[PDB]
Amino acid sequence: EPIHRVSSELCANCHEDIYRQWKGSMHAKSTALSDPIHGLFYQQEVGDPTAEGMVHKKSGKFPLCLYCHAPNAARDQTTKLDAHPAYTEGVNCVACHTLKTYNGIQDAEGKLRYGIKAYDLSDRLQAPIGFPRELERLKAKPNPHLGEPVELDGKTIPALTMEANPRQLRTSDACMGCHDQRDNPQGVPLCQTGKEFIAGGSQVACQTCHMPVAGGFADHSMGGGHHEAMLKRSIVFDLTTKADKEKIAAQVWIRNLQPHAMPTGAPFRNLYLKLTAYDASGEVLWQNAADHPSKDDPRAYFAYGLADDQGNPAPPPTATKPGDDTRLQPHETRELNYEIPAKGVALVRGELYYNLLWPSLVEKFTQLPAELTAPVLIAVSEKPI
Ligand code: HEC
Ligand code: HEC
Numbered sequence: 001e002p003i004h005r006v007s008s009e010l011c012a013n014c015h016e017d018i019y020r021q022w023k024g025s026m027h028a029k030s031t032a033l034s035d036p037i038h039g040l041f042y043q044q045e046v047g048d049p050t051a052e053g054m055v056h057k058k059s060g061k062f063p064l065c066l067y068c069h070a071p072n073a074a075r076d077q078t079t080k081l082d083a084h085p086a087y088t089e090g091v092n093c094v095a096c097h098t099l100k101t102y103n104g105i106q107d108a109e110g111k112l113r114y115g116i117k118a119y120d121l122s123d124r125l126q127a128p129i130g131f132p133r134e135l136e137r138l139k140a141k142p143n144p145h146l147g148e149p150v151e152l153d154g155k156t157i158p159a160l161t162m163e164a165n166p167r168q169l170r171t172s173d174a175c176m177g178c179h180d181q182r183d184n185p186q187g188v189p190l191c192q193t194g195k196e197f198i199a200g201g202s203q204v205a206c207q208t209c210h211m212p213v214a215g216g217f218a219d220h221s222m223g224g225g226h227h228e229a230m231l232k233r234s235i236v237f238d239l240t241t242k243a244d245k246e247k248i249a250a251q252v253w254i255r256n257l258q259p260h261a262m263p264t265g266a267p268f269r270n271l272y273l274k275l276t277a278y279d280a281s282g283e284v285l286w287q288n289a290a291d292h293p294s295k296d297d298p299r300a301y302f303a304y305g306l307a308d309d310q311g312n313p314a315p316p317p318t319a320t321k322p323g324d325d326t327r328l329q330p331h332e333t334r335e336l337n338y339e340i341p342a343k344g345v346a347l348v349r350g351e352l353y354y355n356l357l358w359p360s361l362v363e364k365f366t367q368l369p370a371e372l373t374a375p376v377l378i379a380v381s382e383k384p385i
């Protein structure tokens with residue numbers, strides 16, 4: 001009966017195109033039931049997503065994950081995510097479309113309020129325009145948003161009452177409760193897409209890039225790191241070479257097209273550059289990094305780490321200080337210079353790889369689907385010599 005427990009399948013009766021986009025997105029796959037990466041961490045940090053009364057294994061509190069990953073379950077104070085479509089559907093139509101007023105993530109006493117807790121919620125759907133039809137009433141597909149139930153194809157559709165809310169729906173208020181920041185228990189940022197967005201100074205709403213008008217309405221696919229086309233668009237990558245004595249001076253230019261860091265969001269996202277010089281038989285003559293750049297060429301590893309009081313790497317739950325951050329900064333163009341011995345080199349090839357998880361985690365959790373965990377080739381540049 002309450003709007004937040006209405007299944008996305010009901011909406012799909014009249015918004016099939018948006019439904020199709022949404023259903024394939026990580027928003028629809030956000031729960032520990034549907035995303036095996038999040039599920040592995042949820043099991044380790046909280047417990048079974050098919051159990052009621054679960055708490056965080058350290059804090060003993062209602063699991064904070066759910067505020068962002070299973071909003072309608074958190075709205076109903078339940079941890080049993082398989083009990084109802086409102087919970088299995090993750091960040092679903094009504095989860096986003098019942099957010100009314102964004103209060104910010106930090107309250108006046110400094111308490112962090114995540115996900116649905118950063119908002120006043122409505123029992124009415126919230127829309128960018130709604131149906132401002134008072135003038136038409138004053139003068140005087142089926143639409144269930146006009147104050148009454150409607151019949152569709154012989155089936156009664158309940159009233160799905162709606163309010164216009166342009167400031168919520170058209171600005172970053174639509175995203176920030178879940179995407180601004182998340183800190184560990186010592187206050188260290190884990191995710192910090194909002195602080196990055198502030199620092200970089202952009203005035204573009206997340207939707208302008210992430211909900212583009214295509215085919216005449218706002219695209220709900222909202223792909224990021226799970227979507228290779230988006231990742232290839234997300235940077236400009238180029239390789240230049242000049243002669244330099246008996247070396248080849250190779251310049252790798254990487255421009256971040258985003259107003260947040262690249263890669264933003266989860267702390268384990270990372271990129272790395274492989275730059276390789278080959279002879280004319282295709283045999284390797286030189287490489288920037290023999291194996292993984294994190295170990296062999298740190299300037300070519302673009303990542304965030306956390307640290308202990310000593311500055312040394314620490315697991316995210318116990319870290320007390322940010323570690324180094326070599327990710328591309330908002331709208332940054334990074335130049336990396338290499339000096340390659342020229343003898344026999346016929347081809348210099350640069351490759352930029354994106355990864356959902358740190359290599360430590362990929363090496364450990366080898367039962368995760370290999371399609372998830374494999375490096376993603378997101379840019380290539382070749383120069384013949
Ligand atoms: C038909 C029986 C519908 C059902 C079921 C739902 N909606 Fe709807 N919606 C309907 C119409 C005819 C329209 C107008 C435009 C169109 O697509 O033909 C809408 C519009 C919306 C909007 C946008 C309003 C705006 O600002 O322009 C939203 C945000 C919306 N609808 C959401 C929504 C949700 C979340 C649903 C399930 C809970 C849902 N609608 C069902 C018709 C029908
Ligand atoms: C948050 C991640 C959302 C989810 C999940 C869904 N919608 Fe959405 N929708 C959202 C925003 C912020 C906006 C406004 C975009 C802007 O910047 O203007 C919308 C818009 C709609 C519309 C209007 C589309 C248009 O006329 O171009 C409709 C009809 C709509 N949304 C419906 C809808 C349905 C049916 C969903 C589940 C399948 C759904 N949305 C999920 C934010 C989010």
Ligand code: HEC
Binds near residue numbers: 194197209269
């Ligand atoms: C265009 C100028 C953008 C604006 C405005 C914002 N984002 Fe973005 N974002 C953009 C691209 C091209 C990509 C792909 C790169 C990628 O890493 O996937 C992204 C990606 C994200 C992601 C995924 C990050 C990851 O794990 O790799 C998220 C969570 C994201 N963007 C969020 C986001 C939010 C909340 C925004 C407004 C504050 C926002 N983006 C603006 C391009 C653009």
Ligand code: HEC
Binds near residue numbers: 177222
């Ligand atoms: C909480 C209720 C959210 C709101 C509101 C928005 N997003 Fe979201 N987003 C959320 C989660 C929990 C996740 C990850 C789920 C998982 O298990 O991986 C996401 C993910 C994204 C992504 C990345 C998609 C990918 O390919 O991995 C992007 C680009 C994204 N979200 C964008 C985005 C925008 C632009 C929003 C406002 C319009 C928005 N999200 C709202 C949780 C929530």
Ligand code: HEC
Binds near residue numbers: 042064069178
């Ligand atoms: C909102 C403030 C969130 C809270 C609280 C938690 N998570 Fe989350 N998570 C959130 C978003 C917006 C995203 C997408 C980030 C991006 O870069 O695109 C995520 C992602 C994850 C991931 C990665 C999932 C994947 O790549 O498929 C994991 C492993 C993850 N979150 C786990 C997790 C757990 C275990 C939480 C509670 C302890 C938790 N998250 C909370 C937003 C939010």
